[PDB]
Design a protein around this ligand. Structure first.
Ligand SMILES: Cc1cn([C@H]2C[C@H](O)[C@@H](COP(=O)(O)OP(=O)(O)OP(=O)(O)O)O2)c(=O)[nH]c1=O
Ligand SMILES: Cc1cn([C@H]2C[C@H](O)[C@@H](COP(=O)(O)OP(=O)(O)OP(=O)(O)O)O2)c(=O)[nH]c1=O
Ligand SMILES: Nc1nc2c(ncn2[C@@H]2O[C@H](COP(=O)(O)OP(=O)(O)O)[C@@H](O)[C@H]2O)c(=O)[nH]1
Ligand SMILES: Nc1nc2c(ncn2[C@@H]2O[C@H](COP(=O)(O)OP(=O)(O)O)[C@@H](O)[C@H]2O)c(=O)[nH]1
Ligand SMILES: [Mg+2]
Ligand SMILES: [Mg+2]
Lengths: 649, 649
């Protein structure tokens, strides 16, 4: 079917034939809206815009995104986009059309759960949940398990922190028995992640687990992904993530000692950070409450697990807490599944985020005369304020799987904007990733996205009031993200006036920035993942980097001896017979870029990031000394997410 | 320590040294009682009675029963017995001493959880829980999981019925996904049984699962114990039990069809029985709601699973429901872990039982002159009324792990008396198990235990009122167990007067009889398990049946050629060179007794059994035809528990 209202009509009237059950795929209010504005909405749609998707991006859309009736596809990409626009915007037709246009022209896109569920009856548009283990008891464990199950019924990944659970051998009152510890309890959770598929479909598993490196069960925990296992000791479908206090990095650097506690013989450690933590830790240590070991014995094991599995993830507890606008809430005990979100959670508050990404290439414009291109920072600023408003709408229109998630979200209203196609943007603008021009561009991009999102949230706070927990926040006092890094902003945008308005009117959102992986939403738009360099100049069907391809032909030098060398060399063009140094410098693979520049750039953009970002590390010829220096480099650079995956060859 | 109050004192003042935590092992009221009656209670104890336990029975007591302080034993058997007596009886010192005496002289014993926890702070003295799957939803599954976890924190086995859970492929509303079915949900439960050890001690695993043979997931379910598995398809630590409607046995016998439904496409089947079930089933069948198959295809698979694993257990739904005094409550959906308990359960009611067993040998008395022995039915009657009162006390003094278990138990007050050492009783009295004299003795024993327990409960109903749900019950109408089998009682006891009193005054207990396996409590007292024949005349340390041993020597014929033949022949004396036919007939192994006599005897005693009993079947040279005839034999004999385990050689 062409006509959109006709498509909506089918979707809405759909009935499951195998069961005789009316199975509507559109909500009542979004049906009524479409029908009450059929002519406007149908004639707004430009189907020519369906041809903006590459063969692969469209096949990503077809396989898992466009709504289906009886297994056959029912939605054209333009129909999905308008459905999302209405689901987000409802009655505000003006904004719906604005978002339809911006999205269909590929200026930005919303995270997968949004694309799946916006305008449908069960509108669960959130990607992230961070859950607190409720209590160190069988009941608390099982209330928490139930909660993960209920959340796993819907789209979205889970970060779960377990710092409060009794380690192996700890005592259980009213029985000569002792605790089994973390591993056997992790196994239960792993099994629940395997069971709750949403049925029998394909994105299954995936809980990230958060632990501080002092927990006595740590050596087994970091190893939960080891493939050569002792079998029952592992958790195949779960991800270990380390919640590292500075003290640990210090002890490792000093080649000193590290002490392992059960939370029960050393209470309160995860409910403080910084100097208060170091004082409590050091006191417990001297009081003989734990099992002292050599710091570097744990370190060696961490690196060994990382080298082999790519995990555990590394997120610095102290950086996260010290530099968070949610610090008036209490101590943040975890990140999330992909290490971008940094939000407070408690037994009654399960932190949620809704994400979107701005497509960075869309703002490159030659508009001057011929050839020479610039970057439209003004349009970016403009779009980022649109994306900001959309994500607030989503907050209010979202259906929450559990009450801890609704209570959390309505209270603090956190939002997460990110990017895709940074590599595309550098490549188009003739900038090497490690160039000074790339370094500058990365700072200014993140500056304007942050400023925009903050300005738009301040405007929303004027219309609607600040978020419930604004007062007492570092924003209420004028302390914006970069301030908490003790830096002046780059200064492309007027921060004094914005800060002046925040202090006066509030912001609508406790948080706004968390550049995410964009793993599937980068494929729809056809750009490179988030903020990371190209991994290979040969996609695989087998595709060669389009900006590379173009360049080779313009030089004549593209034959077959060129096509074969690329498949040989893993899409690297370094040390290749007849290629200019300019291309070599431009089309470096991530394996060919100084992991130090990656971390520098990460640290530069990080002053404009409210939350954190999913920072993969790529080591070509990996060693323990090499990896050690990347961890400590990022740690001293003040990073929140020292490391997402360790990807290796 | 000798002195009991001194032993109590230590137990009560105990402190966990590893943690500095006061870890009392006696309750406050039982401490105060002991101290307030020290002289009476200490001088009541006869330590000479500790020598009534065989080497093996005492080592059973030492290993897991007598309370420990720092791993060292702290309790003499006489101390445990008095602790149980007080835990059960509290302030009623008279009854405490009565029970101490009867128990220490080995007239009866209480079930393991009682021996473990009576008089201790967390007094969980129940052995059995039957749990209802709460709802066909992720929430209901997980509320139920939590509940099993909480119950598995304490002693006792669980029967769980799952008839209401959507089979594989069934539809899930608000998602193109479909159900995973029973197997993946069973796997979750299996994993929770493995986790909740009570810590790190030794009786772990064990949930029995109840399903009607019409559930579409049945072929995989019956196979959950198969050792040669497809791995993830199994549930190693759980037990399948079949809840079989008569219709199924009919269809199998008629070589007809059997139809498999999801509970969602055929609702209400587990919430009826008998003719109402057959009408609803047959209607669903004709309406095309299920997947028709040949009855005998399911049958063949059942027998194949049973032959290999010993499971599933077989309990007849219709026999259980038709012949239950709890039938005014609603339709009973399961038995329990060992197939003795038949009690109603609902999402808000989790059926509980407290068990004890009467030691059948203790009532044999020569008292006449010389040699000739009789059986004291009058003393048995007397003791069984004591055991009855004790188990009511336990109801009121028990600590319930979950509120569904307390609500259930306080309402209907079910009790479960059983026996051990029936084989000992036959062997002592010179009766072959398959003799007419054994057959008679089995009937009269079960008659007097039933009558006693009923009389004592009627007396309690006069003191305390009938149980909440007495009115409307078959007991309130004069329908006692045997009446529901359309039989006159054997007539050793005056049933008219008892029935007359019940009708007038009520009974305290909805149910009273459920002969259980006695697996460990038969070893303490040193008798053969429950009501089953000796399996071998050679225990194994290696011990030969004591009544056999004695007989051989009295005949001279006991050398070493005799000792070696017994270890050869698996403790069988059939076809053995120089042994009288009288001994052969007396010391038949269970493998040498007509499984038909077993079932006859089972069916005779079953008219005096309120609930059911744990009826193992023993097939020497097993075939599908042989097994088939035992199942149908027991089914037509009207048995509730057609089969507990299939034990084989
Ligand atoms: C019962 C049980 C608990 N545990 C763990 C889970 C919890 O983290 C921890 C204690 O939980 P719980 O024992 O359920 O909580 P509790 O009320 O008994 O607390 P306490 O005994 O200390 O007063 O023990 C096991 O590992 N295995 C078990 O069998
Ligand atoms: C969500 C989910 C449910 N199930 C099973 C568990 C339940 O038995 C059954 C439905 O449970 P639920 O879907 O949790 O209950 P519901 O509110 O969605 O009920 P319905 O959709 O039919 O209105 O599906 C799975 O096997 N896998 C899954 O991923
Ligand atoms: N459950 C689940 N959630 C995921 C997965 N990948 C990403 N997410 C969630 O979505 C967020 C970012 O997703 P991203 O990789 O950018 O992909 P996108 O949401 O499809 O655009 C993370 O913070 C996760 O919580 C997954 O494989 N499983
Ligand atoms: N959890 C658990 N419960 C059991 C086990 N064996 C028996 N039970 C429970 O106790 C009841 C009868 O136990 P029985 O075998 O006679 O042994 P006893 O309770 O130790 O005397 C059953 O109905 C079960 O619910 C076991 O191995 N594990
Ligand atoms: Mg507790
Ligand atoms: Mg439901």
């Amino acid at each position: 079917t062409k006509q959109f209202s006709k498509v909506v009509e089918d979707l809405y009237r759909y009935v499951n034939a195998a069961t005789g059950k009316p199975a509507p795929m559109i909500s009542d209010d979004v049906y009524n809206i479409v029908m009450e504005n059929k002519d406007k909405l149908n004639s707004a749609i430009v189907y020519d815009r369906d041809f903006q998707y590459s063969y692969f991006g469209f096949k990503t859309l077809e396989r898992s995104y466009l709504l289906r009736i009886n297994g056959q596809v029912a939605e054209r990409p333009q129909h999905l986009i308008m459905r999302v626009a209405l689901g987000i915007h409802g009655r505000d037709i003006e904004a719906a059309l604005e978002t339809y246009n911006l999205m269909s022209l590929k200026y930005f896109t919303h995270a997968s759960p949004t694309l799946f569920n916006a305008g449908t009856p069960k509108p669960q548009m959130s990607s992230c949940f961070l859950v607190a283990m409720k209590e160190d008891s069988i009941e608390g464990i099982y209330d928490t398990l139930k909660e993960c199950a209920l959340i796993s019924k819907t789209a979205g990944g889970i970060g779960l922190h377990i710092h409060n659970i009794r380690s192996t051998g700890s005592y259980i009152a009213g029985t000569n028995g002792t605790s089994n510890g973390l591993i056997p309890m992790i196994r239960v959770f792993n099994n629940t992640a395997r069971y709750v598929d949403q049925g029998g479909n394909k994105r299954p598993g995936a809980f990230a687990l958060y632990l501080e490196p002092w927990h006595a069960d740590i050596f087994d925990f970091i190893d939960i992904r080891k493939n050569h296992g002792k079998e029952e000791i592992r958790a195949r479908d779960l991800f270990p993530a380390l919640w590292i206090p500075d003290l640990f990095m210090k002890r490792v650097e000093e080649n000193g000692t590290w002490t392992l506690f059960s939370p029960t013989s050393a209470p309160g450690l995860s409910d403080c950070y910084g100097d208060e933590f170091e004082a409590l830790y050091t006191r417990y240590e001297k009081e003989g409450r734990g099992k002292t070991i050599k710091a570097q014995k744990l370190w060696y094991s961490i690196l060994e697990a990382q080298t082999e599995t790519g995990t555990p993830f590394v997120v610095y507890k102290d950086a996260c807490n010290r530099k968070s606008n949610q610090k008036n809430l209490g101590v943040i005990k975890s990140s999330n599944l992909c290490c971008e979100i940094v939000e407070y959670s408690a037994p009654d508050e399960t932190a949620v985020c809704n994400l979107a990404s701005v497509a960075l290439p869309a703002f490159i414009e030659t508009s001057e005369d011929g050839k020479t291109s610039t970057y439209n920072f003004k349009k970016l600023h403009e779009i980022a304020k649109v994306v900001t408003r959309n994500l607030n709408r989503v907050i209010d229109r979202n259906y929450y799987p559990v009450e801890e998630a609704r209570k959390s979200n309505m209270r603090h209203r956190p939002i997460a904007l990110g990017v895709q196609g940074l590599a595309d943007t550098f490549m188009l603008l003739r900038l090497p990733f490690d160039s000074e021009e790339a370094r500058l561009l990365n700072i200014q991009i993140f500056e304007t996205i942050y400023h925009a999102s903050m300005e738009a949230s301040c405007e929303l706070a004027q219309k609607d009031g600040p978020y419930e927990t604004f007062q007492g926040s570092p924003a209420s006092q004028g302390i914006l993200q970069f301030d908490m890094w003790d830096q002046k902003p780059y200064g492309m945008w007027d921060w004094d006036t914005l800060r002046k308005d925040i202090m006066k009117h509030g912001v609508r959102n406790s948080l706004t920035m968390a550049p995410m992986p964009t793993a599937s939403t980068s494929q729809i738009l056809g750009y490179n993942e988030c903020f990371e360099p190209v991994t290979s100049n040969m996609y695989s069907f087998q595709v060669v980097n389009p900006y590379l391809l173009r360049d080779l032909v313009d030089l004549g030098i593209w034959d077959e001896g060129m096509k074969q060398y690329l498949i040989t060399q893993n899409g690297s063009i370094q040390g290749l017979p007849n290629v200019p140094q300019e291309l070599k410098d431009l089309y470096k693979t991530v394996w060919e870029i100084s992991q130090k520049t990656i971390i520098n750039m990460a640290a530069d953009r990080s002053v404009y990031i409210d939350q954190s970002h999913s920072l993969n590390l790529f080591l070509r010829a990996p060693t323990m000394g090499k990896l050690t220096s990347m961890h400590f480099y990022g740690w001293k650079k003040g990073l929140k997410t020292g490391m997402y995956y360790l990807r290796t060859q």
